[PDB]
Amino acid sequence: DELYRQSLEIISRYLREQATGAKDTKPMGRSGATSRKALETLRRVGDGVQRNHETAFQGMLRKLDIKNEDDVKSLSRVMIHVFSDGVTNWGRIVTLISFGAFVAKHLKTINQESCIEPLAESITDVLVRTKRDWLVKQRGWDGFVEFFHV
């Protein structure tokens, strides 16, 4: 499964970049072109979604009661509940990743930067295993970037 690897890489780099603030060096593996502008798409749109959804994001974060990695292994079930209810679109998916970034910035504050990698993997696993076929019909991240062009 490569869609898992491509998605995980995009989600990881965006979350860590949000958490840290550095636009990261390093090679963007393979198929980097689509992944590069989805990440660039996430920079432009995802952070604004966080601004537009700040109240419930702060509320959700306060109720989740995140402290360590053993909390992360329980966030998936709440993620699966809030996310999988309804019909699929890219707005839901960019919202999913946006709150992951919100959680990532919080995790750094409480000095829990090592937990950003499970989160992104939990996010990635929740997305593909529930939206795989749809992501294939939408041509994956190509249809993502095509959707969010400016």
Ligand X SMILES: Cc1cc(OCCCc2c3n(c4c(-c5c(C)nn(C)c5C)cccc24)CCCN(Cc2cccc(C(=O)O)c2)C3=O)cc(C)c1Cl
The contact set with ligand X (CB under 6 A) reads 53, 56-57, 60, 64, 75, 78-79, 82-83, 91-92, 95-96, 99-100, 103, 123
43 vs 147, beta carbon nearer ligand X: 147
31 vs 88, beta carbon nearer ligand X: 88
Residue with tokens 């090592």: 114
The DSSP secondary-structure symbol of 45 reads I
33 vs 82, beta carbon nearer ligand X: 82
Q: How far apart are CA 106 and CA 109, in angstroms?
A: 5
The residue of the chain with the least Cβ separation from ligand X equals: 91
Q: How far apart are CA 90 and CA 49, in angstroms?
A: 12
Q: How far apart are CA 53 and CA 94, in angstroms?
A: 12
What's the closest the beta carbon of residue 115 comes to ligand X, in angstroms? 10
